[PDB]
Every structure is written in structure tokens, then in C-alpha cells.
């Protein structure tokens, strides 16, 4: 505060759909006071206990039971940054574990689960306070959500079907910023469709709508992309300033 230039003021790359790009004050506090994205959500926190039980039962070997002089090949697994154990087949584990998340044996909004292949680590997070956003799931080079789910959403006008049911189909997922680093994320159904040799075909998530990266005040401003970027920031202050 008051005399210190720094890089935690400049919009960082990871703030994509996590925190509004252009909604931070124009005064000395610029960029330090940020504003949450529209689709952004924040994990409320949960006990790690169930995950630990499923892992030990699946095939995770306990720390003091293994032999240290034989672990180089093995992948280290952590839960809330606590090093719980080791594994010799992380690919079947990750695939199975996610399947459980889609099926809700562990809480979606909660568990973040990340694999860092080049380091052979598996980090899992269930602590409070992580920023995450909903995305569509794509599978076998195409979207997993089908128009029949839409017809239930139209039906909601007189039925109990809801966004929670939509999460229960496992067609949408919650992704925190640490996990968002390791996904291959298509911009829009259109692009994921035309693709043949256009770019790649390995996508795993897709954006529910790209204009969601904006925070509350930035959404009032129409055609924000035909404006010079700081121009959008002055409007986010002034819109908040108007009366009515």
C-alpha cells in the first residue's frame, strides 16, 4: 500500500474465467482489489477422510509399509498437500477416480484432482477457498452433453429437474485453477466440431460460454470486445457509480 510497484497488480494468465479481466479500481489499489468472474464459484471445504479410505482400498500402499529403496518408478499421491502414499499404476487410478466424481461418490465442487505426469505426482485438493468454474465435458473428440438434457431443462418449468441433475449426468465438471492448467479446453462447440486436422483432437473440456469470463459490472457494457481494453475498465468503475 502506497509506494510499491509489483507484479501482483497486473492481470495474470490464470485469471481466465476465474476473476473478471477488467473490473479492478483505477486508483492506487488498481489490480489488488479484483472482482470475481460471473461463472466463478468458490469451494466451501470438506473432510478428506472419505478419499483416504477409497484410495487405501483401491491400491494405494501406506507409507511406513513400503520399502523406500523401491519407489523411483512409483507415483507419489498427496491429499491436501499431505503426502499420503505411492502408486504403480496412476493412469487406471485417475480414470477410475474421475468416474467416481462424475458419479458423485466424492463431492464435485470439492475435490480437485490433478496429475503432473512429467513429475509423477497426483495432487488432490479438498480444502476450502479454491476458485473454480463449471465446464462441459467432451469425450472421444466430441461433446458428451446431448440435446435430450436440454429438453429436460425446458421441462423444469413444471418439473423438478435442475442444474444439480445436470451435474449428476456428469456432463459438466467443476475445475479449479490448478487443475485448469492440465486440461485441453475447446473454446466453443463449433470449433470442437469442425476439427479434423485443423488443430488437435485431444480436448477434455469445453466452455459453457466464453463471454462468462466477465465479472458482474463488466457484463453491462455491450460489445466490450469492440472497445480498447482499459476503456472497459473505466466503465466498470462508472457503471458501479451510476444511480437509478
Amino acid at each position: 500500500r502506497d509506494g510499491k510497484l509489483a507484479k501482483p497488480r497486473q492481470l495474470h494468465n490464470t485469471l481466465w474465467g476465474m476473476v473478471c479481466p477488467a473490473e479492478t479500481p483505477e486508483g492506487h489499489a488498481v489490480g489488488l482489489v479484483k472482482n470475481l468472474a460471473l461463472m466463478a464459484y468458490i469451494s466451501v471445504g470438506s473432510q478428506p477422510s472419505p478419499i483416504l479410505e477409497f484410495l487405501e482400498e483401491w491400491s494405494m500402499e501406506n507409507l511406513e509399509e513400503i520399502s523406500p529403496a523401491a519407489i523411483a518408478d512409483a507415483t507419489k499421491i498427496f491429499v491436501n498437500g499431505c503426502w499420503v502414499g505411492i502408486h504403480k499404476d496412476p493412469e487406471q487410478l485417475m480414470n477410475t477416480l474421475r468416474k467416481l466424481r462424475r458419479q458423485m461418490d466424492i463431492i464435485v465442487s470439492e475435490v480437485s484432482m490433478i496429475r503432473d505426469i512429467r513429475e509423477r505426482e497426483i495432487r488432490i485438493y479438498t480444502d476450502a477457498g479454491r476458485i473454480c468454474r463449471p465446464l462441459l465435458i467432451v469425450e472421444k473428440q466430441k461433446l458428451l452433453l446431448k440435446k435430450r438434457h436440454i429438453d429436460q431443462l425446458k421441462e423444469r418449468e413444471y418439473n423438478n429437474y435442475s442444474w444439480q441433475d445436470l451435474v449428476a449426468s456428469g456432463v459438466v465438471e467443476y475445475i479449479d485453477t490448478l487443475e485448469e492448467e492440465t486440461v485441453m479446453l475447446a473454446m466453443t462447440p463449433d470449433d470442437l466440431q469442425e476439427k479434423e486436422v485443423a488443430y488437435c483432437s485431444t480436448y477434455t473440456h469445453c466452455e459453457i460460454h466464453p463471454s462468462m469470463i466477465l465479472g458482474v459490472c463488466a457484463s453491462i457494457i455491450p460489445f466490450p470486445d469492440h472497445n480498447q481494453s482499459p476503456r472497459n475498465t473505466y466503465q466498470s468503475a462508472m457503471g458501479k457509480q451510476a444511480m437509478g
Binding site: 472419505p50 482400498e57 483401491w58 513400503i66 520399502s67 523401491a70 467416481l100 461418490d105
Partner: protein, 222 residues
């Protein structure tokens, strides 16, 4: 021979034992089998360059578990026993470690989530309180206060200032155990009023303080 000696007979036989990891629910079921004399049977089927091990539960106890073999090369596992007769013996070496795999990991989970729920239920915070009016009834005094009053109201209260000689004897008796005491202790052991115990201690004795007004009195030892 002594209890500090470790019997090597088992080790001296070079006896091998098997090490199997099992889920708590299966062993809890065994735990409530008690002494039926069995919990199941183990089946081993061997082929060319391959071995299959499995377990079947007792049908009575149920009212196929495949085995996965494990490396033991990286640890020299052995077993010892601590007897109820306080005798120690080295029973054998682990020649194999293994894991008991469930018949199905997937559906099980329904039971498991329910299973987790049964051990794990602190149904907390949980139900507001709608409203309450128990900021407590107002008696005439605390119930226990009345108990305190009753105690005070039982014999003890006034003290026996009469008979200086017996009280003199009591001081002499104090002087029979130790050279000095705290005046707080002196009133406790004598059951007399402080002003009077002082009046006597001025007459036949002296005082000696230490540190921060910590005082002891003595019947002039000589």
C-alpha cells in the same frame, strides 16, 4: 532363563508365514465369528508360469476374494510374539505379502458410502432450536448455596478459645513435629481464632519471615 530373553526356536526352524492385507469389514465379520473354528477356505490354482490364489467365505458366516501377490524383497519382515505369560519368541519370517481384492469394487460403494455413514455420524449443528425460554428458574438462592449455608450451619463456626493449656499443649505438639509452620496451618490445626493464636504466639514464641511476606513461627527452639 529370564523374561528378557528372546526365543529363537521359530527363527531356528526358519519357519515361513504368509502376509495378507484385508478390509476391516471382512475382519470385523471374522471378529463376530468369534470361535466358530473357521471363517472360510483358501484356494490356490497353479498353471504354467502363472499362479492363481483366491478365498471363499464360509456360507454360514455370510449370513470369491481374489488374492494379489506382493513384493517382500525390499524389507526383511519377521514375526515375534509377546506372550500373556510374558515370554518372547521370534515366530517366523514373512515369505509373502498379499492383498485381498473385493469381488466388486464398484457396487460395494453403495454399501461403503452407507458403511462410512454408519461409523461416521456426528449429526451436527443440524437442527436450530426453533426457540427457548430456559434462562433458568429463580430460586431464593443457589441450591448449593443453601448446601453451603447448611454446612456452615452444622456445629463448626464459633471456636473453642477456652482452655489455654490444651491449646498450649497443641503448640507444643506442633513443636513435636517440626520447628516452624505457616500461620494458616496453625489456625487449621488448632481450630482457633487468628487474633488469639497471635496473642498466644506473641506470649511464648517468635516469628521468622522469608522472601515475599512468607512467614513462619517457632516456639523458640534452643
Amino acid at each position: 532363563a529370564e523374561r528378557g530373553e528372546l526365543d529363537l526356536t521359530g527363527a531356528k526352524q526358519n519357519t515361513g508365514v504368509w502376509l495378507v492385507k484385508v478390509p476391516k469389514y471382512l475382519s470385523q465379520q471374522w471378529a463376530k465369528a468369534s470361535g466358530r473354528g473357521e471363517v472360510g477356505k483358501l484356494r490356490i490354482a497353479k498353471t504354467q508360469g502363472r499362479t492363481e490364489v483366491s478365498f471363499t467365505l464360509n456360507e454360514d458366516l455370510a449370513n470369491e476374494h481374489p488374492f494379489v501377490l506382493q513384493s517382500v524383497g525390499g524389507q526383511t519382515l519377521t514375526v515375534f510374539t509377546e506372550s500373556s505369560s510374558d515370554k518372547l519368541s521370534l515366530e517366523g519370517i514373512v515369505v509373502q505379502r498379499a492383498e485381498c481384492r473385493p469381488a466388486a469394487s464398484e457396487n460395494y460403494m453403495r454399501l461403503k458410502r452407507l458403511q462410512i455413514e454408519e461409523s461416521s455420524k456426528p449429526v451436527r449443528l443440524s437442527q436450530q432450536l426453533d426457540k427457548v425460554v430456559t434462562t433458568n428458574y429463580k430460586p431464593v438462592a443457589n441450591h448449593q448455596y443453601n448446601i453451603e449455608y447448611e454446612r456452615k450451619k452444622k456445629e463448626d463456626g464459633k471456636r473453642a478459645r477456652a482452655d489455654k493449656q490444651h491449646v498450649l499443649d497443641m503448640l507444643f505438639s506442633a513443636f513435636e513435629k517440626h520447628q516452624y509452620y505457616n500461620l494458616k496451618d496453625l489456625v487449621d490445626i488448632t481450630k482457633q481464632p487468628v487474633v488469639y493464636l497471635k496473642e498466644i504466639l506473641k506470649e511464648i514464641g517468635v516469628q521468622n519471615v522469608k522472601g515475599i511476606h512468607k512467614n513462619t513461627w517457632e516456639l523458640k527452639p534452643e
